Design a protein around this ligand. Structure first.
Ligand SMILES: COc1ccc(F)cc1CC(=O)N1CCC[C@H](C(N)=O)C1
Ligand SMILES: [Zn+2]
Length: 139
């Protein structure tokens, strides 16, 4: 679990969104596993606007943060689950690192701020849904 709180927005994995998230929907994209809902309180997370390929992520299954090199956002094949059939997920970045399903939502951060959130993993790899292209999160 985990979310990004920026301005009047809450960014979460689409497969983990709640009833309240869907009742206050701003935007959702199944192909990216993202959903943004509105909030009454003000969020203070800074979103990075960069092309960094290094950062730190929070891994809840280990109660630890890990430094990683990650690939540029791209389409990556993702196995079927109870949330989606087998498909390509777009805007996904991979890193070598530990992850388990409950790790989804952990933030990936570089020196410029929030990069994305854990969205996939398996076999010593972890995938992050990128958020740096969502310029509207700021205005
Ligand atoms: C962090 O997730 C891990 C990690 C290790 C694992 F063996 C398995 C997973 C789960 C995973 O990748 N899923 C299930 C939930 C939806 C995801 C998606 N974005 O389509 C795909
Ligand atoms: Zn950066």
């Amino acid at each position: 679990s985990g979310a990004i709180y920026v301005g009047n927005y809450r960014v979460v994995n689409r497969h983990l969104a709640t009833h309240n998230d869907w009742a206050n929907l701003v935007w959702e994209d199944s192909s990216r596993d993202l959903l943004v809902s509105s909030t009454t309180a003000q969020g203070c997370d800074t979103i990075a606007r960069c092309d960094c390929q290094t950062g730190v992520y929070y891994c809840s299954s280990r109660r630890k943060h890990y430094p990683v090199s990650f690939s540029k956002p791209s389409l990556i094949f993702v196995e079927a689950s109870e949330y989606y059939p087998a498909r390509y997920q777009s805007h996904l970045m991979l890193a070598v690192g530990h992850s388990e399903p409950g790790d989804c939502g952990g933030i990936l951060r570089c020196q410029h701020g929030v990069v994305g959130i854990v969205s996939t993993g398996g076999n010593g790899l972890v995938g992050f849904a990128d958020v740096r292209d969502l310029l509207w999160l700021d205005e």
